[PDB]
Write a protein that binds this ligand. Sequence first.
Ligand SMILES: [Ca+2]
Length: 149
Amino acid sequence: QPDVSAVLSAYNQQGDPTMYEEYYSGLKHFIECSLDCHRAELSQLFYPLFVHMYLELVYNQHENEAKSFFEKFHGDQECYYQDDLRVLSSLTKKEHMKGNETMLDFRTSKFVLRISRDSYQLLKRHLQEKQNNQIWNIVQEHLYIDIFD
Ligand SMILES: [Ca+2]
């Protein structure tokens, strides 16, 4: 397991923080409008992407944006993540993350994700529609994700 500082290194490369809600809303609509088979697989992305993006906003001192992002998307996460989310919501400032062992519980790389190539194809295409979609960067650099036939 990585140390705290290694975990926090994951939240360095921020995107345009004013667009995070747009990116996540875009993904949500894309996933919800997919065929059942693709939607079932891709729905796995929701929680880890939400946690990473929120912490990215907080870590880069976009406190307003983080609060707003959390308020908009925490509600539709799986019911069994809502206890983890209450704890996540107490982390509102960069100060709260630094030197904090609880960050181990939210490390993006602990969420194992497996999807079909078909689903990946389609996801990749959606995420390349908008220029420098930050979710595409998180998928490339931080998600523990494998694709299969
Ligand atoms: Ca839980």
